[PDB]
Amino acid sequence: MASAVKSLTETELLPITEADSIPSASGVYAVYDKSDELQFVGISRNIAASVSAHLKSVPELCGSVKVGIVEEPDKAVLTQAWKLWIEEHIKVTGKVPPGNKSGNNTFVKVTLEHHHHHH
Numbered sequence: 001m002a003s004a005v006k007s008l009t010e011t012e013l014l015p016i017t018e019a020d021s022i023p024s025a026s027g028v029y030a031v032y033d034k035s036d037e038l039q040f041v042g043i044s045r046n047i048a049a050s051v052s053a054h055l056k057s058v059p060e061l062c063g064s065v066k067v068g069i070v071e072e073p074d075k076a077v078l079t080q081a082w083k084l085w086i087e088e089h090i091k092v093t094g095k096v097p098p099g100n101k102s103g104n105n106t107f108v109k110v111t112l113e114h115h116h117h118h119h
Contacts, residue, residue: 003078005068005086008038016055016062022048025104027069028081034063040099040107043078051102051118057110 005011008030014022016031029047031040039061044050047067055062068081089095099107104115 001067001069002068004072005039005081008066008088011066011068011085014066014067016051016065016074017049018035019052019055022051023064023067023069024048025069026073026078027067028078028085029068030066031061031062031065032064032084036063036091037095038085039095041082041085042107043082052109058106095113 002010009033011030022042024046025048026045026107027047028043029051030038031042031051032038040054042050047069051065051067055065066085068085070077070081086096086100098104109115
């Protein structure tokens, strides 16, 4: 990262394939699918872990990931960055997919398969 990231425009790009090289730090991350679109932004204390977990669970969004590591452990900074990040894509394309919404949390509970409501 260059400095304290606010927007995606200040964020570096990492391929999801090289999950080993993803920073195991605290910050915000933006998941870009194969077509390079932002469909999932999230904040985590460990980006690498979270990224590697949900991307192997649902590899549809496997394209690239932009990670914003902020050395300041402030929750508002994390959430603020998250906000500018989601807003960049809201403004330019308008994408707000179910993954970022509190609906079916595929990204929060990964590979465990227990969304308890059988059909």
